[PDB]
Structure formats: structure tokens, C-alpha cells
């Protein structure tokens, strides 16, 4: 009945003065915009239909046309930034915010979804949705004693839209908006649905991707233990955002990092640092690199949890990006560590893989490795065992690699290699 209409027929129906004809044409538009392959969004926009749909959003007496137009506009807003902008330019934001209070749950859900797409376009539309007052009604939709009474799809859509309100930087979301959203986010972070958990973790990861004051806003809510628990989940879609959030948090101050450690995060890293998903391994090793950049007691907790052998493992075999993160972790470790910690590192077998990685073409990883070797040599000097370390490097085939780097294009690599050769070889 409303299937496979032409845009011409849709226009004729919507331009009729008959609300039922308008409803049928709007539903045909919705079905066109819901097709799997290349929905004709641009044709619908060029036909001038967005203002009509937006006006239909306000037909409180015809809830079906509200729903159909909300769905059509949601799918238009799901397209390119220009198509989302076409929806915003038609006045859709305040109309959808008004629909958030609809007594019909499917209409409220559709408005939530549409605002999620609009905010997901970027920081400008995110902040514009916020300025029009979306957060209060959105959060009111979740003000129930037990989230489990809400329909699963409804709650998932609310969580996703809230996550888009937390997303993007340059600028980051307004501080007052983040403080307004965070308590509901914590509650959602304790929900049992895997998709709600995943999107809540993503929102926290966004909110912690910034300066230390944003991180502090988050960690003062006490969510770090829940994030560690989720770090241990079996569902990769939960572990990925949980790990991103924990890594962001350990980019902060030593005290925030210590909050991560105290919550028991390090005990999860034997599995994370051997995870079959390359992205998990890379992100876990980056997190480790930022933990080894911390205090000597924090390096010591890395040692106690038995993680140095796992760093040697990643450095020995992993995708190259993860090996680069591991090199960074080793260099930070040797920069901040005691002499005893550095000798422990050597005793775990770091030198041979660290030397094998000097065969790489990336200049940055070579510089990182040369810095680490210099630090290890400084510790050896403090112990008077520099000759033993030199022999160690020579047996690995590393002296050849260093003396070869003496002929490298980068000045820093050149000078560092020559300095090592002159002082210790």
C-alpha cells in the first residue's frame, strides 16, 4: 500500500490538504528512507519535504504521522553531515525535544534516536542539541526505580544518544552538561544489558579523553572499580571501551593512575596483553606504557603483578604497532625505574627483543629503543657492570645494529648510536 512509492507520489500526497493522505505519503517516505540500498535521501530533501515532516512532528492529534515523520527525519539525519544539517535547518531539534515527552513510547524512542543522530554529527550540533534543553527530558526518561522495567531497545537507544552527547572534542561537551549526565551514566554502567554496558563504557571513554580535570570529574564518581570489572568481561564490545576508558584515566595524574591500580586493573593484563584481538593488545600495551611512566612504587606494582615478562612477550612478538607501544613502555620504565627495577627488566630478557626491534624502519621506535638502552646502560654504570651489558648486547647481534644506525639519516638516531658506541663499545 505504501511500498515502493515514487518521490513524485509522496510529494503529491504530502501537498494534499488531507491529513490521512499526508500520513500515507509520509509512511511511504519512511519506507523509502528505510530501504537497505542507497535510500534516496537527497531526492527527498530536494523535493522540499523536510519542513513538512517537521510540521508533522507537532501534530499531537495524529500520533501516527508524528511517528512516521520522526522516523523519516531520523533516517535523513543518519546520512551525510549536509543531510543532518538539512534536518537541523528545518527546525527539527526543538520539535524532537518536545516529542521526548510524548505519551507514546515508540514516538519518544524515535525522538531519542533522531537527537542521537543530530548530536552524533559533531560538536556543534551536539552543543546545539544541549542548548535547546535536551538533557533534562532525556534523563527524565530514565528516572525509574529499576532500569529493568524499561524496554530493552528503548534503554539501548537512550544510552546511545546520551553517549553521543558525551562524544567529540574541540570542544569537549560543556562541563555542566557532563556533570548533569554523569550520575545516570554511572547507573547505566551498572546495568546488565551488554549493549547498554558497551555504550556506557564508550561514553565514559569519551569523557576521560581530555585534560586531567575531565578525568577527575569521572573518577570522583567512583566508577573505576566497575570499569575494571567490565575490563574483565567476556564480550569484546564491552572490553574494548572499558580498556579505552582505563587507558585514558591512566593518562592523568599519578593519583588517578593509582586509583586504577588500587581497583585491581593490573591483574587483568596477563590476558589483555595476550588477547587474540590485535586492537586489545595494542591498547593494553599503550595503557601499560602510561603506567610505567608513573611513580617508582607504581612500576613496582607492575613488577609484582608479573607483567614485565608479558611486556617482553609483546616486544618479542606482536603486530608492529603493539611492539611500538611496548618499546614506549620499556623506555618509560627505564626512565623512571630504580636500578633494581632496571636490572630485573634485563633479567627478564628484554635486551634481545629490544635489539631485534632496531631492525625496524620507523625512526621513532629506533629513537625510543636507543633511549631505553642508554637508560639501562646508566643503571649498569651505577652498578659497575656496563661491560656485562655490552657483552650481552654484542651476543644478541645488537652491536651490529647500533653501529649500522650510526649511518642513519635522522640526526638524533645518528648521535645516540654514536654516543652508545663511543661510551660503551
Amino acid at each position: 500500500g505504501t511500498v515502493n512509492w515514487s518521490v513524485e507520489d509522496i510529494v503529491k500526497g504530502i501537498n494534499s490538504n488531507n491529513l490521512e493522505s499526508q500520513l500515507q505519503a509520509t509512511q511511504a517516505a519512511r519506507k523509502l528512507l528505510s530501504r537497505e540500498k542507497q535510500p534516496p535521501i537527497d531526492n527527498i530533501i530536494r523535493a522540499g519535504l523536510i519542513p513538512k515532516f517537521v510540521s508533522f512532528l507537532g501534530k499531537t492529534d495524529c500520533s501516527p504521522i508524528q511517528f512516521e515523520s520522526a522516523w523519516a527525519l531520523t533516517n535523513i539525519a543518519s546520512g551525510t553531515s549536509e543531510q543532518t544539517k538539512a534536518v537541523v535547518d528545518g527546525g527539527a531539534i526543538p520539535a524532537f525535544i518536545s516529542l521526548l515527552a510524548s505519551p507514546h513510547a515508540h514516538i519518544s524512542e524515535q525522538a531519542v534516536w533522531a537527537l542521537g543522530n543530530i548530536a552524533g554529527d559533531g560538536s556543534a550540533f551536539r552543543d546545539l542539541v544541549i542548548k535547546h534543553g535536551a538533557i533534562d527530558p532525556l534523563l527524565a526518561l530514565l528516572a525509574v526505580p529499576d532500569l529493568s522495567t524499561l524496554a530493552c531497545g528503548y534503554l539501548r537507544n537512550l544510552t546511545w544518544t546520551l553517549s553521543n552527547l558525551c562524544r567529540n572534542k574541540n570542544p569537549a561537551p560543556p562541563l555542566d552538561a557532563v556533570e548533569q549526565i554523569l550520575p545516570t551514566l554511572v547507573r547505566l554502567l551498572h546495568h546488565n544489558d551488554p549493549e547498554v554496558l558497551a555504550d556506557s563504557c564508550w561514553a565514559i571513554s569519551y569523557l576521560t579523553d581530555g585534560p586531567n580535570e575531565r578525568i577527575e570529574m569521572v573518577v570522583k564518581k567512583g566508577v573505576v572499580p566497575q570499569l575494571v570489572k567490565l575490563l574483565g568481561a567476556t564480550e569484546l564490545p564491552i572490553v574494548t571501551p572499558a580498556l579505552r576508558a582505563i587507558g585514558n584515566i591512566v593518562t592523568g595524574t599519578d593519583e588517578q593512575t593509582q586509583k586504577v591500580i588500587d581497583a585491581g586493573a593490573l591483574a587483568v593484563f596477563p590476558s589483555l596483553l595476550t588477547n587474540p584481538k590485535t586492537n586489545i593488545q595494542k591498547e593494553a600495551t599503550w595503557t601499560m606504557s602510561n603506567i610505567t611512566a608513573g611513580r617508582q612504587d607504581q612500576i613496582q606494582q607492575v613488577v609484582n603483578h608479573g607483567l614485565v615478562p608479558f611486556l617482553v612477550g609483546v616486544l618479542s612478538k606482536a603486530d608492529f604497532k603493539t611492539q611500538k607501544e611496548a618499546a614506549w613502555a620499556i623506555t618509560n620504565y627505564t626512565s623512571g625505574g630504580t636500578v633494581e627495577q632496571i636490572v630485573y627488566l634485563v633479567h627478564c630478557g628484554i635486551i634481545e627483543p629490544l635489539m631485534n626491534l632496531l631492525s625496524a624502519k620507523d625512526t621513532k621506535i629506533i629513537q625510543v629503543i636507543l633511549d631505553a638502552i642508554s637508560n639501562i646502560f646508566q643503571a649498569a654504570e651505577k652498578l659497575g657492570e656496563t661491560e656485562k651489558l655490552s657483552i650481552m648486547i654484542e651476543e644478541c647481534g645488537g652491536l651490529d645494529k647500533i653501529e649500522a644506525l650510526q649511518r642513519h639519516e635522522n640526526e638524533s638516531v645518528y648521535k645516540a648510536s654514536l654516543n652508545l658506541i663511543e661510551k660503551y663499545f
Binding site: 546511545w160 599503550w286 611512566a293 623512571g336
Partner: peptide, 19 residues
């Protein structure tokens, strides 16, 4: 030894079409 922040996301827009 300084902390290193995460790389900028290359996914700049997050939108969902309702099928």
C-alpha cells in the same frame, strides 16, 4: 617519562539508520 594521550579518532560521525 611523560604520559602519552590516545590518537585522535578517525571516525568523526556516529549515526544510525533505522531499517
Amino acid at each position: 617519562a611523560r604520559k602519552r594521550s590516545h590518537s585522535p579518532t578517525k571516525k568523526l560521525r556516529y549515526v544510525k539508520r533505522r531499517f
